[PDB]
Design a protein around this ligand. Sequence first.
Ligand SMILES: O=C(O)c1ccc(-c2oc3c(Cl)cc(Cl)cc3c(=O)c2O)cc1
Ligand SMILES: [Cl-]
Ligand SMILES: [Cl-]
Ligand SMILES: [Cl-]
Ligand SMILES: [Cl-]
Ligand SMILES: [Cl-]
Length: 331
Amino acid sequence: GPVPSRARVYTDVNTHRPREYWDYESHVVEWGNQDDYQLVRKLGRGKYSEVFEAINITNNEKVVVKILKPVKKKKIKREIKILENLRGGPNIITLADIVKDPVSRTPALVFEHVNNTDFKQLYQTLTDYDIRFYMYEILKALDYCHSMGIMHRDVKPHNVMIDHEHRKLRLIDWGLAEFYHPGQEYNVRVASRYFKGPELLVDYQMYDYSLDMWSLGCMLASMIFRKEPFFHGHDNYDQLVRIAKVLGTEDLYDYIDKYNIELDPRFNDILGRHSRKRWERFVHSENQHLVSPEALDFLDKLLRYDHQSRLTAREAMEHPYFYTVVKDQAR
Ligand SMILES: O=C(O)c1ccc(-c2oc3c(Cl)cc(Cl)cc3c(=O)c2O)cc1
Ligand SMILES: [Cl-]
Ligand SMILES: [Cl-]
Ligand SMILES: [Cl-]
Ligand SMILES: [Cl-]
Ligand SMILES: [Cl-]
């Protein structure tokens, strides 16, 4: 059958942790008091679901309340355990409390209050240095959660909040996150279509942290090329076709043969044969001040079919694309 795969880095982090760190089903959720918080107003209305600004009356502090949609108890405890494990990490949203409605028993997460200038307003006015800076901030969050044995599995602009005034960034929406365990098969119905890695589109279940690095590559390509989204597929099959129309089908079939991925029969005729299009083909005039040789080389090392060939978050942070960004943050 499929050839087994292991992550290149952070492979055994959860194995060296105590069991209670990652065994979220055995964790006992200690719910707080809902009456400690009063809702003030809706936040991100139209784009975000059940996100409220609230006041913690026990200390007169502003917080954010996220009322969760009805899902299984297993997924609730998983997200809570992951948020608590990552609390305090760089650029990770901070979980403040866990409350539940008395009568309806609806779960709700309480987060720290930060500013959010959504990408829809910044996608049109991001500088070349601003792209590098915020990419690096996302990489810090990804390296941390990967080093803590966590896959985010839903990296996309909607799940990244940017405080443009304070130059701050938070990775949010950890409802699809999971713990990485060597040899475990994972669900392929994760992330959004435009940011799904090829391992999800070919139903290879033994993926790892490198899935997040593909999604990040999709975000970078949309920013420096001014094409949102960069891989604009209309269904799951078309998503892999649009990727194949850029990376070529030669490396896709080598990827399929490397891990003995039994691709479905009709899907093989869908892909057909496509040559690899060089990254300079997507550059023109308006998106020209954002494309550099180091930007294309960095993007090329993220958008690889082979999940084991993509850069890790740490290797990405040391790419020359961030050379000046690294030295400027150190001051
Ligand atoms: O479930 C989650 O992972 C999650 C976590 C945090 C937030 C969150 O959203 C905000 C929005 Cl949409 C607008 C504004 Cl102006 C501020 C915030 C904010 O401070 C904040 O923490 C939303 C969802
Ligand atoms: Cl949402
Ligand atoms: Cl998005
Ligand atoms: Cl899973
Ligand atoms: Cl496309
Ligand atoms: Cl990594």
